[PDB]
Design a protein around this nucleic acid. Structure first.
Lengths: 81, 61, 87, 79, 212
RNA sequence: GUUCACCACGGUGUGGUUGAUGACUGGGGUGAAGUCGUAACAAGGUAGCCGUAGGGGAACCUGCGGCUGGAUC
RNA sequence: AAACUGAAGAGUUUGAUCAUGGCUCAGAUUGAACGCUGGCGGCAGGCUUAACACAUGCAAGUCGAGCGGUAACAGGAGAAGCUUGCUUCUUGCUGACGAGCGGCGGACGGGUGAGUAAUACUUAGGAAUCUACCUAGUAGUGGGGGAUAGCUCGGGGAAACUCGAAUUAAUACCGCAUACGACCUACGGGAGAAAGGGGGCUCUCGCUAUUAGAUGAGCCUAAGUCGGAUUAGCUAGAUGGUGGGGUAAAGGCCUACCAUGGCGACGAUCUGUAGCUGGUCUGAGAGGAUGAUCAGCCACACCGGGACUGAGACACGGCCCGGACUCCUACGGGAGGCAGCAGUGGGGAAUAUUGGACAAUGGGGGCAACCCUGAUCCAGCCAUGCCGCGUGUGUGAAGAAGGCCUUUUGGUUGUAAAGCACUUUAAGCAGUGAAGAAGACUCCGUGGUUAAUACCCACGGACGAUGACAUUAGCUGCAGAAUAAGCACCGGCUAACUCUGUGCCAGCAGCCGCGGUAAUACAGAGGGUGCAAGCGUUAAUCGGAAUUACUGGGCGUAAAGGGAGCGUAGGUGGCUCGAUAAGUCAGAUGUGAAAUCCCCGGGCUUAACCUGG
């Protein structure tokens, strides 16, 4: 199926994820369908930590995509603020 | 191929295993390679002091 | 095979392949009667062979022995050849 | 959809023609436009058009091994 | 790596005072030299060439600021990509180095001692906007407009710093630096202009040297 | 199960292409104060050169046509 | 606002000159190797050769909430020999669970670049298809049957395994009954499913038929895409048509017949070489070279061939047959495939650990608990590269000694050293100590559901179970200059010069060249120059080379006009008035993946690096 999951970039011991809509069988950092934002695990109190295109996130949910347990909680604690 | 042994004095004889680098000798017809001195079986030069690395000579203590 | 599961898959494959090949042979057998009756230009023999092959064809196509597309194409292309044989 | 115009250079196949499409390809280094030409077999069902005609053809599903274009208009005819 | 050997040798080879020694006494009497470059021969025949004038000019700046070839060529590569004059930009980025900034603010007698102070975590930097200092052991830190510099709480009683301010007062304090001796705290208000920098360093020779 | 059809292996023959070698032989190049001459550069002591043919130890010579990239006139 | 910034020449032909013209050099770069040397850290990178052969361990399992069950382990209840606190035997009763049937997964993820010059790749489109799991629906899930693995009984085999008889369960298998769709139709009608499990009649996980999405896959078209003509003709299922077959699907994909077509100097055919792209290096650019690491696509999995199961494979750790090689054997027969991750032998100039954890991000199975994951996250080794820091800092002259040169007394090494005054980065020792963690479970409340205050789902709180890295990063103390400099070069190009030895020798050399008894060129010294934990050499690419000239060259004599013509393909082409709008130009839309390059910013102590637009 299609999943909304994180794709790891950044550097060694400085992870920076991009939340991405991909076919589930592709490698985590390989081919995807659409990039809909990013997540900085280590970010300051004065810098954009989580960004997520909520319009395309809802479109992909209604379209068939299945979020992971990390992006689901990220959106959960990102839309409450 | 035929190669040139650089430096003063060497220990090479029949059935000696050498490392060979590029570089042609101008005044020697036919010679087109140099023997790296100090690599495998070709020893470094004995009393070399100035350009030691080019002749495989350890730093004298 | 180098794992118990690959070995199980192989011995399951032999059983499933025997069971499916018997039904594949059955489909071929029931279509042979229709083709042979068409060969000797016999509308009644071809029709009575065709009528008793449709249930077999569509039952094996629903089981997965042949594709539904193949079953439909065979039905249509044998009906079009029988009807033109002095409908 | 994807229409293409050209002259008929062969009609000696049943329900089939060969159309010569010409194009101007520009040289990547010297920048002059060479005129190049490809032979494309088209499907002419009623077998009407003759060689020397201008014809329009469109891409369709393949009809044969080397034929996937079909005739739609004979815009010009041999004089 | 940095140069460790003698400095008057360098000054004599460049033919000018590089400020490598302290100003506690005049450069002429500190060495009774600079009329001749070092070595057996010194002043020579067979006059120099365009490449010699360019090489010596580049070595002059490199030896003044204590920056080796690799870092200095990175400086020139950055300066030729920033907008404006390449030599002006290279002088600005050599002047914005943390060790040079603390030397000009006067906490160190020479740029070598200023770099020695910076390296040993005796200088805290406060980035513009940030409400905090941070101890920084990196002499090559580029300071932007408004960065604050202060002396460590456990090194304000240094004797070398206290005799470095009184030399800075005798030498002059730049106007792009706002230094207060009361709590050993300066502010880098702006990178210096080419008109503020001395008009005896031909950065044009450095720019023409880094063009093959 | 049998048999036929398709077909992989493998086999047979006869060619093509190409690598390494080969007695001997052709020319090319390099290397010394070698041998034979002196063909060219001056009108180089028969102006030289181009094509071609014949001849000659060797540079070359000769014929026929051509050129001036020929001095003395 | 910005992405708009970039271009050097020198030596060498001559007695000298100008030109021509080759050679050579100064630059940048690398998955580099070698030589000399070597302190640290961050981030990267690391078999380029043998797609050579591979010892050993690991890289694909999971589900008992589908099923019979009980081999092991642990409990529970009773039998209690009780040996009085020793202790055993019955039971699947429970947590669970080997083997077995069954499902899903194993077609992903990972590796390699052999083949492939075009079923490839890139760009742009297209129609004649299939698509497990996912989303939103629709019609259902009714009723039977015969088996069979394990388990038995008896054999055969050294093993691998195997044969026969009997026989049990299922969401295994096969009829029958129905069918909103869907399939066939001559459109009158025909045919075609399913399976149950679980939680308290409901809900939930499934199954069946199908629609629409999404995802993926197959298929087609056009354009582009290496060298050779000392390879010019190539094709007979070949090119087209029909009838038929075949496929999920178009199609000579196959076949019978009919026609004689198709392709080619715009390079067919044949040959050599090659995975392609984004990109990478170089360059002012245009170009040239290249296709490691990262990402996309393709191909392959010891070699040749065939298929099965499946939504998907002609399947890397699946099957069958054949082959080479390797191993076991009781000689009858068997087994195997690191181009997965470590690692070995070998080849080579040359490329690392037989490490840890699933904590994070993903992936497989499961209702969950949880299990698996050499993907991945980390750690180890290596100056292989990039970036960063250090090896101290000031002050110190009758300018000590020593070395070297020298006119024999000066100069130089040189504030250099010694002495004095301080400092402790990094390393070492001792403490402290974030963040990577997403808050599972459990409790409460609310909403949906329902016959229900159950169960289940969704939401809102409380709670702190979870860290390989790890003795973390960072921060704070202690001690003491203590632990830390080498390499190349110095005739010119090209920054830096003198002695001594040698004597066309020994030797150097990129080029010009040097060496013949006073060598700034050899070897050693002193001094100096450039780089610096690196420095040189070699290999390789572009540059300089306007030296293939598109940008941007030439051809009277320097290399270069075909002996001359006629002419085919082709290239190019007068004036005027119209048409068209293909080239051309402009606009709009779609696309041109992300990363990279560049600009503006943000975060690492800075930088490299990461990252938003």
């Amino acid at each position: 199926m299609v999943v909304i999951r994180l794709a790891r970039g950044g550097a060694k011991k400085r992870p920076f994820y991009q939340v991405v809509v991909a076919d589930q069988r592709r490698a985590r950092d390989g081919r995807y369908i659409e990039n809909i934002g990013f997540f900085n695990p280590l970010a300051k109190e004065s810098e954009e930590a989580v960004r997520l295109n909520m319009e395309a996130y809802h479109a992909w949910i209604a379209k068939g995509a299945q979020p992971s347990d990390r992006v689901a909680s990220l959106v959960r604690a990102y839309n409450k603020a | 191929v035929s190669s040139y042994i650089g430096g003063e004095g060497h220990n090479l004889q029949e059935h000696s295993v050498v490392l060979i680098r590029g570089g042609r000798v101008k005044d020697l017809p036919g010679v087109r390679y140099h023997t790296v001195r100090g690599a495998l079986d070709c020893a470094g030069v004995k009393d070399r002091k100035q350009g030691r690395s080019k002749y495989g000579a350890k730093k004298p203590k | 095979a180098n794992t118990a599961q690959a070995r199980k898959r192989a011995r399951q494959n032999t059983k499933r392949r025997q069971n499916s090949a018997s039904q594949r042979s059955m489909v071929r057998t029931y279509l042979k009667r229709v083709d042979a009756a068409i060969a000797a230009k016999d509308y009644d023999a071809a029709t009575e062979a065709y009528k008793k092959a449709i249930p077999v064809l569509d039952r094996m196509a629903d089981k997965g022995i042949i594709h539904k597309n193949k079953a439909a194409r065979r039905k249509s292309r044998l009906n079009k050849t029988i009807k033109g044989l002095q409908a | 959809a994807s229409v293409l115009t050209g002259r008929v250079v062969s009609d000696k196949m049943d329900k089939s023609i060969t159309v010569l499409i010409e194009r101007l390809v520009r040289h990547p280094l010297y920048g002059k436009q060479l005129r190049r030409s490809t032979k494309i077999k088209a499907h002419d069902e009623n077998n009407v058009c003759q060689q020397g005609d201008l014809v329009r053809i469109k891409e369709t599903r393949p009809i044969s091994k080397t034929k996937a274009w079909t005739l739609v208009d004979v815009v010009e005819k041999v004089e | 790596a940095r140069y460790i050997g003698p400095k008057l040798k360098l000054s004599r080879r460049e033919g000018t005072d590089l400020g490598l020694k302290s100003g506690v006494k005049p450069y002429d009497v500190k060495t009774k030299k600079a009329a001749r470059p070092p070595g057996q021969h010194g002043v020579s025949r067979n006059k120099t060439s365009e490449y010699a004038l360019q090489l010596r000019e580049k070595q002059k700046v490199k030896r003044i600021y204590g920056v080796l070839e690799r870092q200095f060529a990175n400086y020139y590569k950055e300066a030729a990509r920033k907008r404006g004059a390449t030599g002006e930009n290279l002088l600005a980025m050599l002047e914005s180095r943390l060790d040079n900034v603390v030397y000009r603010m006067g906490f160190g007698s020479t740029r070598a001692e200023a770099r020695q102070l910076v390296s040993h975590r005796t200088v805290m930097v406060k980035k513009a906007g940030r409400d905090e200092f941070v101890r920084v052991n990196i002499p090559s830190i580029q300071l932007q407009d408004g960065d604050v510099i202060a002396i460590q709480e456990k090194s304000r009683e240094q004797l070398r710093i206290k005799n470095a301010i009184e030399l800075a007062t005798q030498r002059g304090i730049p106007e792009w630096l706002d230094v207060d001796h009361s709590k050993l705290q300066g502010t880098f208000k702006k990178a210096p202009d080419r008109i503020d920098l001395p008009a005896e360093i031909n950065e044009s020779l450095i720019v023409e040297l880094y063009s093959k």
